[PDB]
């Protein structure tokens with residue numbers, strides 16, 4: 120059995136690497152220096168932002184993240200297909216699982232690109248500071264803060280990509296998502312993912328007491344970030360009527 | 376050291392039994408025949424017979440009265456948890472402040488089936504349908520608890536399981552304003568260790584029960600958040616003081 124669970128962990132890590140071009144390991148090598156990777160150009164004010172790119176600031180940056188989210192949903196969707204059992208589920212439920220799982224996964228993986236000071240951008244080529252994001256115009260200045268506050272706590276667990284691979288899989292296969300037709304097949308997959316995760320954390324973090332429990336508890340903070348994020352999008356759509364929002368992102372948010 | 380975790384487990388069950396008059400075992404007995412007055416509509420409610428009487432408002436007032444009683448039961452229980460009373464007193468207050476609602480909804484689940492909720496120490500039964508039939512926005516007060524309860528109860532936890540789970544909720548190191556997170560997480564790790572051993576022993580046939588129970592903590596925080604937004608509204612002055620939170 121436990122040999123089977125190591126095989127699952129290995130499968131998931133493999134697909135993760137295949138699906139997500141900027142891993143936590145690459146992110147950390149960029150963020151902390153040095154030699155395997157290269158140093159980011161740092162955006163920290165209106166000056167550096169102009170010198171950095173080679174209509175207005177906050178909205179343009181907002182469209183930037185909006186476009187990254189779309190790529191992220193594309194990568195996540197590719198990864199979900201690799202989770203054993205996922206593609207065999209009722210198609211409606213595949214859609215439901217992705218619809219609800221995707222943003223919880225975006226914020227988990229976004230934490231890999233973050234430290235307390237800011238976030239990696241343009242595939243690790245850039246680094247935008249938390250302060251600069253926080254200084255942005257009235258509604259946009261609030262978008263990233265909750266993600267930074269999560270990242271700081273989440274990053275304290277010291278998870279690596281092989282851990283995150285299984286964790287993200289656990290998130291996607293939640294049998295407690297609204298409007299799931301066949302809850303049981305989903306729960307049977309998740310049960311196995313949870314077993315695999317537990318063994319993986321035991322093995323990878325032997326000195327780390329109750330890391331499994333401490334990680335599942337983080338799923339609480341993920342839910343709150345989603346709620347807050349979609350509230351701000353409501354504000355943006357009514358205040359910026361000329362603002363375009365990607366169809367993929369359109370039908371994900373609609374009917375939380 | 377798993378004989379010490381069975382000790383902790385037992386200590387916590389012992390205290391829970393002391394602290395909460397209506398146990399899950401007791402409530403399930405009442406709910407599945409082992410007889411309460413039933414409240415299903417306006418006329419059986421009027422006949423039904425409370426300490427809070429000073430329709431939708433009277434029911435909501437009753438729920439708040441009961442919540443205030445429950446806070447003190449939970450406060451008494453928290454004192455039993457090895458290490459809790461040795462915490463900084465501000466942190467004890469913080470842990471209780473943010474944890475009681477989560478525990479109220481957890482424990483309310485023990486008193487609910489999909490059809491209604493035991494009321495008044497199990498002497499009564501208010502139907503789920505009577506509760507949603509109430510005027511807006513009072514008919515939306517209790518439905519999200521029934522949704523959670525039905526899901527939660529499907530875990531089939533017993534009182535000795537819940538005694539440890541509730542302790543785990545109290546000792547959460549992520550409450551805002553905690554001054555000394557270390558001993559709290561130190562205690563909770565112990566309790567999580569005890570909870571895991573309890574569920575392995577009490578439910579050997581359900582593999583990731585531990586995990587599934589911990590995933591229910593997100594459903595709980597969600598519920599508590601939704602509930603406090605419904606409390607946004609948008610009275611006797613002394614009464615209004617008793618029911619601040």
Ligand SMILES: COc1ccc(C(=O)n2c(C)c(Cc3cccc(O[C@@H](C)C(=O)O)c3)c3cc(OC(F)(F)F)ccc32)cc1
Pocket residue numbers: 139180183184185187188190191192194195224225226228229232238239240241242247266348
């Ligand atoms: C698959 O999981 C993820 C994949 C990619 C990313 C990612 O690269 N992102 C980055 C660096 C960001 C941060 C960011 C900030 C400012 C501008 C950005 O656009 C450009 C410059 C870029 O990074 O390519 C990007 C990001 C934001 C996102 O929207 C949010 F979830 F926060 F609502 C979504 C993904 C984001 C995060 C999670």
Ligand SMILES: COc1ccc(C(=O)n2c(C)c(Cc3cccc(O[C@@H](C)C(=O)O)c3)c3cc(OC(F)(F)F)ccc32)cc1
Pocket residue numbers: 395434435437438439441442445446448449478479480482483486492493494495496501520
């Ligand atoms: C220690 O945790 C608990 C202890 C007792 C109870 C409980 O008996 N309650 C019942 C049956 C109820 C359900 C109920 C419905 C209508 C009137 C009620 O008031 C009286 C009749 C009563 O429960 O004694 C009670 C209850 C509701 C509460 O407010 C709420 F959480 F829902 F916001 C709080 C506690 C409630 C719940 C949790």
